[PDB]
């Protein structure tokens, strides 16, 4: 038997997004699945003009619109920002490319650099206290002037 063929969707592409404008004559079935380990399948009965915004990854997506043959799409690495340029541009590029291994990355390269900074600063404070406390404890001394500088020391 002859079955209806729904009007073709109008397809617009955004970064990692497929925007389909669907104009059915009759209630039409729209099914999508991602071509990776998790299908994330979506099944929908579209009866009214509708815009749908499926997220396409690099692994792929496959969408069937009505009795049309299934159509497979893949998203390229076409995100926004300027690698090779200023640090803020680098962050926005890697946030568009990888949303949740930059947040983690920044957060664990910033907490880590902070932790290292405070430990090394504490160690430097301790060595300073140790360097100066003897000379402090001798109100009279000639001061090892180069050391008088290298720590803060108010010489004789």
């Amino acid at each position: 038997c002859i079955a209806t063929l729904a009007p073709e969707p109008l397809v617009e592409h955004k970064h990692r997004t497929l925007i389909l404008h669907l104009h059915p004559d009759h209630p039409t079935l729209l099914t999508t699945r991602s071509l990776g380990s998790d299908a994330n399948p979506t099944r929908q009965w579209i009866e009214r003009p509708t815009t749908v915004n499926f997220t396409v990854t690099g692994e792929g997506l496959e969408y069937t619109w009505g009795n049309h043959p299934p159509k497979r799409v893949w998203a390229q690495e076409s995100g926004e920002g300027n690698p090779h340029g200023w640090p803020h541009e680098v962050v926005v590029y890697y946030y568009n490319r990888y949303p949740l291994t930059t947040i983690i990355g920044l957060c664990t390269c910033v907490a880590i650099i902070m932790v290292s900074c405070v430990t090394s600063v504490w160690l430097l404070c301790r060595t300073r206290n140790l360097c100066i406390t003897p000379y402090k404890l001798a109100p009279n001394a000639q001061v090892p002037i180069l050391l008088a500088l290298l720590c803060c020391i108010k010489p004789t």
């Binding site: 990776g36 390229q76 090394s120 060595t127």
Partner: protein, 441 residues
């Protein structure tokens, strides 16, 4: 000559290699997978379809009481309703006003439509994995022959012996129990034979399409005929086949992970790119040519002209190739950060040749093996503008394909900054310790 390797299970993406044999010039090998079928071993359990309540003619006993007789029939119900005064066009079917009996009998049968539409319940456990492979080696053209992916069955593709398989991952989209309806396959935990409830699914179960057991539980209950009417009323739960048909959610043809396409003669899942496939080809010795009769390429210098990390062949490079003699010569990039489009280049005595390649790196630094000698190509690549494409990627990312020189320099400066600060702290501690010790002692 034997050549072992491992290639991804992706369909359509050619695996390329350079088979090098000591004493002979390399031969270019190209193995591509046209399709890969995971073909389970099924076992038909039963077939379900709509029922037809066959209602034979009622037995009307004029001045008598005729009584029930159980028959070996699916959901057979016989009732003996008494005190019936049937009227039909002649008018007065039995004389006796009240001592009249009608025997109403009904039994469910397989519908006429069971031979065309029905649901087949299957238990699948594990079958073979079959594939069609295209191979080329040297000047031999495409061969396109069919193989079993078990790792032990040779396939004579032209004049080469291919021992493909086994698949690294034993994943199969089908669960233990499946239901086939038309061209759709469902992962339905169907009820066992003789268990099916009244109206959900498997209310009518037949082992085969021509069986005679035909278990059927549809709650047939004969009702009392209407005054004066000879007929056989009955009440039944509506067919669970149709309830299933309008309540079945989604076939395995759509849900199925990895892009399995489910075909149904035989039941198989095709072209799902999961895991990797070992391969072992045996190229004939006629393909190989002695290393002396092949050109020597020297003074190789590669420059990447415009490049972009698109999914298609978004890179062009040119190599200056001052050579000894003229002829065809293979080219390959083994690093795995670039995939070269062309297999061979024709070389004159000197000049330059251009080759296309695909890559995912911002900076593709890859070694190209021309003939015997090798040249390193490095350059910079721009993002592709197109967001969504209609073809799979021809390359593979590696978790370093995006870092780029600036961000590398940043991770350097950061890591080095922490390291230097901590190492300066530890060196400061050592210096204080030494200065105190020399004070005291």
């Amino acid at each position: 000559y034997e050549h072992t390797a491992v290639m991804p299970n992706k369909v359509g993406i050619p695996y390329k290699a350079l088979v090098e044999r000591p004493g002979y010039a390399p031969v270019h090998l190209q193995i591509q997978l046209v399709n890969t079928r995971i073909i389970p071993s099924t076992n038909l359990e039963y077939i379900t379809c709509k029922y037809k309540t066959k209602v034979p003619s009622p037995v009307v006993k004029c001045c008598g009481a005729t009584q029930c007789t159980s028959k070996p029939h699916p959901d057979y119900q016989c009732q003996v309703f008494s005190g019936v005064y049937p009227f039909m066009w002649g008018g007065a079917y039995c004389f006796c006003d009240t001592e009249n009996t009608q025997m109403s009998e009904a039994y469910v049968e397989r519908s006429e439509e069971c031979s065309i539409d029905h649901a087949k319940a299957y238990k699948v456990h594990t079958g073979t994995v079959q594939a069609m492979v295209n191979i080329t080696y040297g000047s031999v053209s495409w061969r396109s022959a069919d193989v079993y992916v078990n790792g032990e069955t040779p396939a004579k593709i032209g004049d080469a012996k291919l021992i493909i398989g086994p698949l690294s991952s034993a994943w199969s989209p089908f669960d233990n129990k499946v239901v086939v309806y038309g061209h759709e396959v469902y992962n339905y935990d169907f009820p066992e034979y003789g268990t099916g409830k009244a109206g959900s699914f498997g209310d009518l179960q037949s082992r085969t399409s021509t069986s005679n057991d035909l278990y059927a539980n549809t709650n047939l209950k004969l009702q009392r005929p209407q005054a004066g009417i000879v007929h056989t009323p009955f009440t039944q739960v509506p067919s669970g086949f149709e309830r299933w048909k309008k309540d079945k959610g989604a076939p395995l043809n759509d849900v199925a992970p990895f892009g399995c396409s489910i075909a149904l003669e035989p039941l198989r899942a095709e072209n799902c790119a999961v895991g990797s496939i070992p391969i072992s080809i045996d190229i004939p010795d006629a393909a190989f040519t002695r290393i002396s009769e092949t050109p020597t390429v020297s003074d190789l210098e590669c420059k990447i002209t415009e490049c972009t990390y698109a999914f298609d062949f978004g890179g062009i490079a040119t190599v200056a190739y001052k050579s000894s003699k003229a002829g065809n010569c293979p080219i390959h990039s083994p690093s795995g950060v670039a995939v070269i489009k062309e297999n061979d280049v024709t070389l004159a005595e000197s000049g330059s040749f251009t080759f296309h390649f695909s890559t995912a790196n911002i900076h593709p630094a890859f070694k190209l093996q021309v003939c015997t000698s090798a040249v390193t190509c490095k350059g910079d690549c721009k993002p592709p503008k197109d967001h969504i494409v209609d073809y799979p990627a021809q390359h593979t990312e590696s978790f370093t394909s995006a870092i780029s020189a600036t961000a590398w320099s940043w991770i350097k400066v950061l890591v080095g900054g922490t390291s230097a600060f901590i190492v300066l702290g530890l060196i400061a501690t050592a210096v204080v310790a030494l200065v105190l010790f020399f004070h005291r002692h």
